[PDB]
Amino acid sequence: MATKTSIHPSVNELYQRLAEDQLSNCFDRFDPQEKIRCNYCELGVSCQLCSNGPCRINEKVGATLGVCGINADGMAMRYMLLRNVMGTSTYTYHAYEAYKTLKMTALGNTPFTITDKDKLYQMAKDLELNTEGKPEDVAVRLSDFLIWELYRDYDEPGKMIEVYAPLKRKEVWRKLGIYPAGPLHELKDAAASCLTNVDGDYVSLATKGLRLGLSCIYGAQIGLELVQDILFGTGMPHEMDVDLGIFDADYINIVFNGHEPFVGVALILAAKEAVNQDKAKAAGAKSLRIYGSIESGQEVVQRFQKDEVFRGLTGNWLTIEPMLATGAVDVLAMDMNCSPPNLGPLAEKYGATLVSVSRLVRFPGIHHFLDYKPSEVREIAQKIIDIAVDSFKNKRHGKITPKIPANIQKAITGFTPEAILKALGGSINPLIEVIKAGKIKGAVGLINCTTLKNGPQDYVTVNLAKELIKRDILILSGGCGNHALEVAGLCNLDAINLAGPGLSEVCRNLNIPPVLSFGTCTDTGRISLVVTALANALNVDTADLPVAVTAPMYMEQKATIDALFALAYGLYTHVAPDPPVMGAPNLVKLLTRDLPSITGGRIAVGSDPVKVADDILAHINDRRAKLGI
Amino acid sequence: MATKTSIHPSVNELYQRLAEDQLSNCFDRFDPQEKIRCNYCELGVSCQLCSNGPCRINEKVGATLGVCGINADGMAMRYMLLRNVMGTSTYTYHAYEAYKTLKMTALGNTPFTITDKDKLYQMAKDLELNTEGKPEDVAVRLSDFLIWELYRDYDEPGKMIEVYAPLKRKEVWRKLGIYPAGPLHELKDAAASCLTNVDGDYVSLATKGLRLGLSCIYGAQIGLELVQDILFGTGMPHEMDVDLGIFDADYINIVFNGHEPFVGVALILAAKEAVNQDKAKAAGAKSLRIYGSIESGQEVVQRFQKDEVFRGLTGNWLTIEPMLATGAVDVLAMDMNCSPPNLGPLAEKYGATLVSVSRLVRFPGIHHFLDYKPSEVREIAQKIIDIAVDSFKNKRHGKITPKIPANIQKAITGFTPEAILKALGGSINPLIEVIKAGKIKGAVGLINCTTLKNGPQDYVTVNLAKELIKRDILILSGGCGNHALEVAGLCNLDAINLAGPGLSEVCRNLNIPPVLSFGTCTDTGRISLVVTALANALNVDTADLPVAVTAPMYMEQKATIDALFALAYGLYTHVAPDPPVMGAPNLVKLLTRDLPSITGGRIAVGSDPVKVADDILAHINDRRAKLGI
Ligand code: SF4
Ligand code: SF4
Ligand code: SF3
Ligand code: SF3
Ligand code: FES
């Protein structure tokens, strides 16, 4: 058997159960699509945007342009821009909900509280907001200000970008005309540009993609993550359990899955109530447990300890179907992507109950719809617990055979800029010195999804990471790719043994792993805070630093909006598999060859871990040479 | 070469010039695309939204679902929703600019004024705004209120929908859960829903499309059109010259082209200054003239007279390339779609200068970029005039041979709800009387683009309109399909004699044409005002009225968002060519067969003018029978 599966043994074991049970699954669905792949679509040179189409670029038959007159470069970049409107929209949606959650929390309407009050007041001071009165007054003002940043138009100056972006970058952005409006206007402008017979200029469309990336980081991501820190605490390093062996079939098991952590936190709070533990015991369970899945799970493991109630992180999105095949899940509560749309029949077979907790998430076979509102989350969480108790009794316990793989790995989660500074003794200077001395050649932000396109689940990501650390490159990781490295064991102290001589020495001295878990793809803005701090300490631009970004198994456009940001931010940005652009030669030249003279960044490509790592190291060494280190 | 050109002789004559000059053009580019059309994309059963793709549904080879698990129905409806985010974004963009233009006008920083003060105060009263102070003060309050409608979230009640929608519709919408947020939030939510592994439920995606259509009409279109009336007057019927014979090569000819009329109005005002006419004459021209193209042109002909400076409307978007081939254009000033992206080589061959006046519009070979801001529009208009004088002197005069077809048609433009009531003597009741009597069987809103997919330019639109009026169906027209009917002579008093027995009789008595020019696709909201007036007068729901909508040569998603609106509004909605959904059998059943029991509306299909007209008339007659008429 030649099926492309996973690098993880636990997933491979569970794939065997899905196959034995004759259930459809991503791994098996890949090859039928392989058999009929469209080469025009693979290369970005098809278009379906209007009724004169569908169109294809084929010069042999005189189809050099679409009916409307657009060329291959415009066609490919326009569809890229459109798909990235979707990515920006998800981050904007999440930010808005975070800000309404903070406001409603301050008004007393949620089960949450103001946890990191120091961050609240420091952020309010940095943004020149009134800090008089009660903390709850300050939190309302901050929420309203951050909503204003979402809504601000292209002609109203932002404050977040001024506080959180370095001047040398801001100067480049002003020169290029890519200082963004708020993300709601920028995503509306980008979408309008993609309508037929509007923007057909690949350079303009690329520039609009860069603007869109900047609007997403400064106008949505940084604010939402800092607000989530205010609500739930700023992460510090701690030990977490990951992989699918964390499940135990004799407990009531509720799994929260998506990118927004509000329902998951409410569930943990509710499950800690004795009345709910007593319900679980009365139903025949040992107790009631909450688990995190994908990015909502990662948000929680960044800030919360493993305890008797919250048990850790299952894995990334290609683990969801396998997870159901454990026969251990009572409720899967889904808040955003990835919630794959054929989970219904798997939930039926394995005796799990599916609950959507967002109006965004719908697909056949969901059992309950409990759309999130801050003022209702207490009641939503309690309803989910009651559903899970009923499901355990009626569907699963003693009825479904559990087949839980034994694998559990330890990961140190919760790295944040604040945690890095604390490990270094309170300033970034020791890190600068070990980079100057060459103990650490540079650093990579691995900000990534997972996919099957360019290998078994997580194969490229894990092996690239191993090649990078062997070359004395420190990794800061976020996204599904971060979950991969955690499950693969690269985020614990044992992994120091796999790093090169300089990085192993630094890691042992600081007592940190060679891969630092920074959380989600939504934490790209937060990772930029570290890179900005490095540039400022060295008195250089971000494009001058010995760093790079990689999204080596990208899937959806949250990852590519983060890649567009990285390009605007001046960075060498590796992306695999190839985005659908390679049939557009002038667009390829722009992104891979000309952008260094425009933003300083560039796209890099490829899926061979050694070659990709060597190409990243060569970039890092070029930057080092120009710095004289 | 082209197998399909146009029903308009002027366009056919100019196509011959393009072909003899061997310049690329839409007519010729259709044929190569025809040769290689993808059957998957034609049917809506391909997907390019993530890296596990591209995917196709082909059950014969085992590809029943995408890699992610989505089915054909979800796949097709999701791409339809995404494309309609683009449509909604364009209307939202335009509305926001209209509101900022009214506010900046009230503050004294534009060359515009407050023309319809009655409408300003009536709107303010209906929306319960403060009406104290000067008219300018009220205009600022109205502008801010309508911006609030754009921004309103899914959880804050709107006022426009309460004022402008009829009673039973509002009950239906609340029951279905489709009462919308503001269009900015609805379009962001729709886009986020389309990301991989979010919403894969065709019924949910269709419902989201209905909500999005409602948000577009009540949250953007009605406000923007009424604000444009406040700025530039409420249209009343007047005779207008149309078709390409309106050009004269001896004048400096500036053509404005797009959907937003602000630059066009400022150009007309500037061209009336003697300093600019004197400049034109000193350059060797007889004087300086302004002309409207496509929807921006139509907005102006609705509200402005033909005079020595403003000369009328050229035609719809398939006329732009032919227009350049006249060799009579000095500047083509482009503000939105449709600005086809291969005009560059045509402008070069025929001695015209291309100017973009919107940050949305970019494509190769544009000469100048003058992005619109209300406070800069006076300067932008003057710069365009200066560019046009230099272009006439240095590119066109004495260098380019003009070839202007002789064809000029007369059309009565400027019908509005107000003009209809006026024509009836002040009340809608005389129109109800003739409908009840059976002289007018019903009314059709023809809200359409043009395309080459289902015939030569405008063939289906014009012949369908002729067949409808022959069946005693009054037409209210907006969009590129309105421009087609004007050019074909259906909008003047001679066209009365093309109508059937009852409609010709009524039109003769009222001295109106049988096709009433209501403007643009942006005027779908305004057409709903007429249909809502009929529903109220008859005290029946819109789904029970003897009306229908047709978009019979639709192209882009402004038209399909108007169709989704029509469906939500309860109407029989004919669309041709087929939208790309016909390979998704459950989605087809929903839209064509089940929606009558849900919203009251349904999609109808087909491109045969007689069959389409017969099917519309049958629906109208079914409605009539149930009303007792
Ligand atoms: S937008 Fe242009 S390239 Fe795309 S389908 Fe329409 S005519 Fe073809
Ligand atoms: S979203 Fe699903 S159907 Fe579309 S390309 Fe990705 S895997 Fe294929
Ligand atoms: Fe935030 S990273 Fe993109 S793939 Fe779906 S949850 Fe993963
Ligand atoms: Fe407003 S209708 Fe759609 S096609 Fe392009 S201008 Fe026409
Ligand atoms: S599947 Fe239609 S062009 Fe690729």
Residue numbers in the entry:
A (entry chain B), B (entry chain A): 1 to 629
From the manuscript:
Its structure reveals the typical CODH scaffold, but contains an iron‐sulfur‐oxo hybrid‐cluster. Although closely related to true CODHs, CooS‐VCh catalyzes neither CO oxidation, nor CO2 reduction. The active site of CooS‐VCh undergoes a redox‐dependent restructuring between a reduced [4Fe‐3S]‐cluster and an oxidized [4Fe‐2S‐S*‐2O‐2(H2O)]‐cluster.
While the [2Fe‐2S] subsite with Fe2 and Fe3 coordinated by Cys338 and Cys480 hardly changes upon reduction, the two μ2‐oxo atoms and the water molecule disappeared, resulting in a [4Fe‐3S]‐cluster. The S3 atom, before part of a cysteine persulfide, is now embedded in the cluster after a shift of 3.1 Å, becoming a μ3‐ligand for Fe2, Fe3 and Fe4. Fe1 loses its water ligand upon reduction and adopts a trigonal‐planar coordination with open coordination sites in the reduced state. When the hybrid‐cluster is reduced, it rearranges so that the persulfido sulfur becomes a μ3‐bridging ligand within the cluster. This switch of position for S3 and Sγ‐Cys521 opens the channel, providing access to the hybrid‐cluster cavity (open conformation in Figure 7B).
